[PDB]
């Protein structure tokens, strides 16, 4: 908590960040839930009924400044693949976290091949159908770190390969030296 410098906080931006999605449509999608009387946002993908999924979500460019190592906190839900009818033969229960450093913001020009994998992100708890239908999802929290960073800025990216994932929070920070 103390002495943390926040470089990115998806949940606090209130649906305004509009991150790049590749492909657009049937891949990652910005969603809103307002059942708490307060809106919450998320990037969701659930293309579990067709195979060969390779869906990418890329944050906006992050200015590195003096940060030398970054810490990444994700909060997310994952639905049990058994929740789906049976042609879910390509369904997965993990997704992948990537990053890329660059000296310039490439804007809409997103190139998978420039990104390095940080880790596979797996849930401690999957959300089964009975809990989904009762609006009692299981929110997972995972943390990773990356360094050393040397360039003007960096991207984070999330690759889905056929899981039913809702990404509710992405918080990136570094510690003051």
């Amino acid at each position: 908590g103390p002495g943390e410098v926040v470089l990115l906080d998806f949940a606090a931006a209130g649906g305004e960040l509009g991150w790049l999605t590749h492909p657009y449509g049937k891949g990652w999608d910005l969603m809103q839930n307002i059942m708490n009387d307060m809106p919450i946002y998320m990037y969701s993908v659930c293309n579990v009924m067709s195979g060969d999924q390779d869906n990418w979500l890329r944050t906006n460019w992050v200015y590195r400044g003096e940060a030398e190592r970054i810490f990444i906190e994700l909060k997310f839900t994952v639905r049990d693949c058994n929740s789906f009818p049976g042609g879910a033969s390509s369904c997965k229960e993990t997704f992948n976290l990537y990053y890329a450093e660059s000296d310039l913001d490439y804007g809409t020009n997103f190139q998978k091949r420039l990104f390095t994998k940080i880790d596979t992100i797996a849930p401690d708890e999957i959300t089964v159908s009975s809990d989904f239908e009762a609006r009692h999802v299981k929110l997972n929290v995972e943390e990773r770190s990356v360094g050393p960073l040397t360039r003007k800025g960096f991207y984070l990216a999330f690759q889905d390969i056929g899981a039913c994932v809702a990404l509710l929070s992405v918080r990136v920070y570094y510690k003051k030296a």
């Binding site: 969603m31 809103q32 839930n33 579990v48 789906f84 809702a166």
Partner: peptide, 14 residues
Amino acid sequence: XWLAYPDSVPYRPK
């Protein structure tokens, strides 16, 4: 179709 999160709808700021 299948939703990753209950009662969620695609959203885009006005």
